[PDB]
Amino acid sequence: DDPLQQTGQLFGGLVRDIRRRYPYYLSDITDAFSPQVLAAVIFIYFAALSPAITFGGLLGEKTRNQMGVSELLISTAVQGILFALLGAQPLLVVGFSGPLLVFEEAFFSFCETNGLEYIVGRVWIGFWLILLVVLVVAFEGSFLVRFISRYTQEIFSFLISLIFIYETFSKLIKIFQDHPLQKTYNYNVLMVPKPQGPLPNTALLSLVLMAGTFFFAMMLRKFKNSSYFPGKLRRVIGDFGVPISILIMVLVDFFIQDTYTQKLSVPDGFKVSNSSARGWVIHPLGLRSEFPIWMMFASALPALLVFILIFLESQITTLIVSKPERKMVKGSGFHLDLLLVVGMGGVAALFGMPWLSATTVRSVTHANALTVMGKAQIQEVKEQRISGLLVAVLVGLSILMEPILSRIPLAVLFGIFLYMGVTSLSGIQLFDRILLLFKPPKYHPDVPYVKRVKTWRMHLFTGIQIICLAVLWVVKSTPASLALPFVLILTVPLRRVLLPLIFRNVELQCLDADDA
Amino acid sequence: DDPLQQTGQLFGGLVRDIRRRYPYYLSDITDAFSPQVLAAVIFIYFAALSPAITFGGLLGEKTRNQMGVSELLISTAVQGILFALLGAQPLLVVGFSGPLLVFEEAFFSFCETNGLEYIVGRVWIGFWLILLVVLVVAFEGSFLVRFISRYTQEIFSFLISLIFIYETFSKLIKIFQDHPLQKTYNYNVLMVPKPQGPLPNTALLSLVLMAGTFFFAMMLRKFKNSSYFPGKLRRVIGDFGVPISILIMVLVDFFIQDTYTQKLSVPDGFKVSNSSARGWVIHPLGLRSEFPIWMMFASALPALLVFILIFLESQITTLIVSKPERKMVKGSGFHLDLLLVVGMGGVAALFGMPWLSATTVRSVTHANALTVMGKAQIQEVKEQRISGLLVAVLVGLSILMEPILSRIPLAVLFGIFLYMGVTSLSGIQLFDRILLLFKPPKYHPDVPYVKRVKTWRMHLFTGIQIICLAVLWVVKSTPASLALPFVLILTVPLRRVLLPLIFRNVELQCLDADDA
């Protein structure tokens, strides 16, 4: 029954993953028939879209429009639809991530330096990723995911959410730096690409919209598990907590018409950003210049790095989402998801669209959205394919529904990112122990490790995980950001060889447990 | 032991009030030796000052400077010092109120029409208030305060808090109306009296400062009764919850130097606002024109109205502050406080300074500030004279402490008013029953009246008190605002004659109880 086992035959895990979930496929359609599911579709849409808009914008300027917002949106749409329809864990949101953007920057700079075609280079990376993932899934390489314990899962899960929170505030600060609070402003300024100068009331309204959206979302989450209004109405309003918070604060900005706020800009149509550069289908052998055969084979070495990026990102996200404490009964497959995510991404490279990964926050957020609360204990989770499908389709149709997206500020969706960032920390025992450092020892949650492990030893354990978080954040800050996944890999040796020396088994078993 | 009893002798209550509290007078100095007491001094200072600044400003413009901020500040200082040193309940904050402001415009408008000297008119009102209060205290007229039950106390206490909250938002709205969020602004504008035109970033920053101060104050109140940090540090930070919230958000505005925010303006020195109109000491017989002897006797009729205003305001505030549920052991005197408050106010009229009253929110706020929490049950209250004395002295020295006050925005102190407004509702059973209207019947607090009175009957009782609140708010809105105290008087007949018909004794006794 345990997914992470070596069968001892070629593609044994892949078959066993299909065999376990596809029996539930008719349930994966009906279970979606709930208002809570529709509230998740609306929430996770904006959670899924705005990153693809942002990263696409960032790719555009750092890759000279070889790959822009349109390519990313279509990729997130097509791979999102397929993965929802064919995957093992539909609650995983497949999209673009920060470590993937860093690779594209380095790959572009590498290609620029050596003087090779970037987009043609990726096609080969994509082919080697298809070769590697088939070779990995063949021998059931996802068995090594067993070794990654809560220690490494939580260190990861915490770091990703901090980033998500950090970046959100970095955008608010950027708005304030762009539109400073001056004494006088210049009004003879163009706003056709974007505002050339500073603008009045822009930065403060952006803060008001961000703070307000995070407030309303949190207060409606507080309202969900309150004792006000009838139980039906309290849940319905609580389930649609974010969509109400968005609608309100979007309508707030709609009425404030004279003042400027930065909105969600999408491409005009379904066309590549730079048409002169590349077409919709990228040629392996080359576009303009004849692509070298040395790079055609040496594409293996970056593809190995991209595989490790997509593997760890996706497989650790699968762990986090399919934890025992989260009441997920339909079953999670680590081989079929890895095969699709990388396999699709490899074929996506052929059409000059970016390979994606099962992103942690968006996956967690989508799981948390579909998770229902009893009495605070988790009753069940609405595990189905319709939520992940509809989000992907809506992301695909984002280019068409510009009229609607044009009235939605970025400030409000940054308020939603802050809500996603804070909410992501909820079921992380690391974060729980970070709070206990500040709380006195008498006022502890009396959890198994609190009762058994000594207070100073528990804090010492928590201390070492901050040292790891700190080191990971330093590695992230430095140019060597593609080394970050390999530093997180060292978190597994730590718990395996280093901690057993300074700590005891009894404490280690209590602090780091598979189930709680 | 019960204060509200007829002794059956002249000035029996006054003697009995002195006899009960003055034995504790040495305790009323030492009990003030606590950090929590110093945190109250800082909090209640701004709570006491900014109203005198505002009402003084309002008197100034509606009385042609015959009485402005200077007179009000000195009155609140002198009467505040004396009442703290000589009073029965030092926790009562004596200051100017809205119903008193209504009388001063009404009396000025009367004097302007008939063509009489306003300030000389008040001197006679003051003499008749001294005659009435001595005649009332003689026969122990504060025995009628017994008839005022939680019903009328809570209806009052709630209405006063709603006003306090309403007015706060009316000032924010005014700022937004004054400094609208436009596309373009004019920078060639004078700001020497105040900004002549609209200004950028002023209204939104004012909202940010107000929202931020109310947030920090509430989160530090939430922190006070949390389980974070050692018990000493949690209380100390919790007790200084408002002063920290003020300091922070004042320093926030200090760093935002280019943008404009409206600050606390006080007079330059200790001089009357309009020297030409009149001097410090007002002459009974007249200043310029010979004051009529018909008004010298007819001054009784407005003085009777002012007495009823100051009596009900102060005596109902004394009830609220000296409730049984609030752990106040040193004893409350309703005769000695009424004698001082009105008697001082009558003598204050002679120097052209405004008669004051024991204001409900500022009294409640000051009591709530000095109230310590155990475990949520009230352990004790730090009842002493030093808090009320120091506030009054600081209000007196506000005119000299201009450099510090000039850097403090109004926006932040409006955030403190909102905090005072919401916190004032805490120990009001009316407000508690307003929440139970929305909550389901199964999730009720299990208080005596919840289990004894039927849910539909309790909601019917609460419904009638909203009808009263509504009627009182309508009477307040209309020109007849001096009729409001006499409408609140009718709240006592209601519970006495009208409710016993539709309701039963058992329910009435449970819903309206002297102790809980």
Ligand SMILES: CCCCCCCCCCCCCCCCCC(=O)OC[C@H](COP(=O)([O-])OCC[N+](C)(C)C)OC(=O)CCCCCCCCCCCCCCCCC
């Ligand atoms: C869940 C409820 C939480 C939200 C409820 C709302 C509470 C707060 C309401 C808004 C007020 C924010 C307080 C800070 C005020 C700063 C004012 C300002 O803009 O100053 C100018 C400053 C700029 O300072 P400056 O003027 O020195 O900049 C330099 C300018 N030159 C170069 C010209 C010298 O801007 C900022 O503050 C930017 C940084 C943002 C910091 C505030 C972000 C917080 C908002 C989201 C809330 C998240 C925390 C909540 C806690 C977690 C809860 C789970």
Ligand SMILES: CCCCCCCCCCCCCCCCCC(=O)OC[C@H](COP(=O)([O-])OCC[N+](C)(C)C)OC(=O)CCCCCCCCCCCCCCCCC
């Ligand atoms: C304890 C924490 C609670 C406080 C922090 C939570 C608040 C989050 C911070 C942001 C403020 C909220 C967003 C308000 C939306 C309006 C913003 C704006 O632009 O206004 C434009 C409007 C003006 O709109 P306008 O300018 O478009 O109107 C048109 C005018 N013409 C046509 C002339 C151009 O501003 C106002 O009217 C002010 C409204 C303020 C209302 C919000 C009050 C916030 C203060 C705290 C309230 C506490 C509530 C909870 C109490 C209970 C506590 C448990």
Ligand SMILES: OCCN(CCO)c1nc(N2CCCCC2)c2nc(N(CCO)CCO)nc(N3CCCCC3)c2n1
């Ligand atoms: O852009 C839209 C989303 N956001 C906004 C969040 O509010 C965002 N911006 C980032 N940017 C900073 C740097 C490069 C430009 C944008 C960024 N960078 C990184 N990293 C790469 C840098 O090494 C860190 C390693 O994961 N990781 C991010 N998360 C995304 C999900 C899975 C991974 C963690 C991330 N997220």
Ligand SMILES: OCCN(CCO)c1nc(N2CCCCC2)c2nc(N(CCO)CCO)nc(N3CCCCC3)c2n1
């Ligand atoms: O934090 C806000 C406090 N302020 C700011 C001024 O210091 C304020 N402003 C008022 N107004 C401003 C705008 C023009 C009118 C005055 C006002 N008006 C009334 N009343 C209605 C006038 O008829 C009387 C109703 O009983 N009562 C008030 N209270 C305060 C004392 C205890 C009692 C209730 C009151 N308070």
Ligand SMILES: *[C@@H]1O[C@H](CO)[C@@H](O[C@H]2O[C@H](CO)[C@@H](O)[C@H](O)[C@H]2NC(C)=O)[C@H](O)[C@H]1NC(C)=O
């Ligand atoms: C589309 O791609 C082409 C080819 O990469 C870009 O072409 C030229 O301009 C760039 C600067 O804008 C230079 O860095 C290139 O060297 C130059 N290349 C050639 C062959 O002329 C073009 O700018 C891109 N267009 C957009 C809209 O991004």
Ligand SMILES: *[C@@H]1O[C@H](CO)[C@@H](O[C@H]2O[C@H](CO)[C@@H](O)[C@H](O)[C@H]2NC(C)=O)[C@H](O)[C@H]1NC(C)=O
């Ligand atoms: C001080 O008081 C005097 C007397 O009331 C005010 O005097 C004059 O100006 C007023 C308008 O500003 C008129 O309404 C008065 O009728 C007029 N009275 C006389 C006798 O000339 C004076 O304005 C006040 N000054 C200030 C600073 O408020």
Ligand SMILES: CC(C)CCC[C@@H](C)[C@H]1CC[C@H]2[C@@H]3CC=C4C[C@@H](O)CC[C@]4(C)[C@H]3CC[C@]12C
């Ligand atoms: C699903 C698609 C898009 C992924 C592409 C990867 C290919 C190579 C994968 C997907 C499904 C896989 C097959 C699934 C099941 C079996 C049955 C087993 O007895 C032998 C291997 C075999 C036949 C696998 C071979 C490899 C396979 C064909």
Ligand SMILES: CC(C)CCC[C@@H](C)[C@H]1CC[C@H]2[C@@H]3CC=C4C[C@@H](O)CC[C@]4(C)[C@H]3CC[C@]12C
């Ligand atoms: C586009 C941006 C600005 C906001 C989008 C949010 C929209 C889609 C949200 C906000 C509030 C939502 C509604 C709130 C509650 C209910 C009751 C439920 O039983 C059926 C759906 C229904 C009727 C929702 C439909 C979707 C809804 C209208």
Ligand SMILES: CC(C)CCC[C@@H](C)[C@H]1CC[C@H]2[C@@H]3CC=C4C[C@@H](O)CC[C@]4(C)[C@H]3CC[C@]12C
């Ligand atoms: C419709 C649902 C099921 C899928 C959502 C995504 C849809 C809208 C997207 C994904 C890929 C997109 C296509 C990608 C490529 C092209 C070629 C171009 O010359 C015309 C548009 C066209 C044909 C696009 C139309 C819209 C499209 C089909």
Ligand SMILES: CC(C)CCC[C@@H](C)[C@H]1CC[C@H]2[C@@H]3CC=C4C[C@@H](O)CC[C@]4(C)[C@H]3CC[C@]12C
């Ligand atoms: C450079 C720093 C920030 C990175 C390392 C994280 C810091 C905060 C960690 C490392 C070791 C930790 C300490 C280890 C042991 C104890 C003893 C316990 O009774 C109280 C907490 C305390 C004192 C911990 C507090 C947090 C701590 C100081």
Ligand SMILES: CC(C)CCC[C@@H](C)[C@H]1CC[C@H]2[C@@H]3CC=C4C[C@@H](O)CC[C@]4(C)[C@H]3CC[C@]12C
């Ligand atoms: C503070 C002053 C100026 C207020 C003036 C009010 C007058 C009427 C008050 C103030 C003090 C009062 C006296 C205080 C003490 C006593 C002793 C008692 O056994 C008989 C009544 C008697 C004699 C009181 C009578 C009324 C009294 C004289």
Ligand SMILES: CC(C)CCC[C@@H](C)[C@H]1CC[C@H]2[C@@H]3CC=C4C[C@@H](O)CC[C@]4(C)[C@H]3CC[C@]12C
């Ligand atoms: C005038 C404006 C800026 C607000 C002024 C508030 C000042 C007076 C407040 C803010 C925070 C306060 C401090 C906070 C905590 C303590 C610790 C306590 O054991 C003694 C008092 C002391 C040291 C307070 C002194 C007064 C203080 C500095």
Ligand SMILES: CC(C)CCC[C@@H](C)[C@H]1CC[C@H]2[C@@H]3CC=C4C[C@@H](O)CC[C@]4(C)[C@H]3CC[C@]12C
């Ligand atoms: C000092 C403490 C105990 C009391 C606080 C209030 C003080 C500062 C106030 C209240 C009344 C004020 C006085 C009122 C009247 C005048 C007359 C004027 O021509 C000079 C200033 C002078 C003399 C004031 C000085 C300051 C004063 C004494």
Ligand SMILES: CC(C)CCC[C@@H](C)[C@H]1CC[C@H]2[C@@H]3CC=C4C[C@@H](O)CC[C@]4(C)[C@H]3CC[C@]12C
């Ligand atoms: C002038 C305005 C404020 C008047 C409205 C006040 C509201 C709150 C009052 C007026 C009439 C009241 C209702 C009258 C009758 C009933 C039926 C009873 O079985 C439960 C309470 C309930 C439902 C009351 C609830 C409160 C109520 C709705």
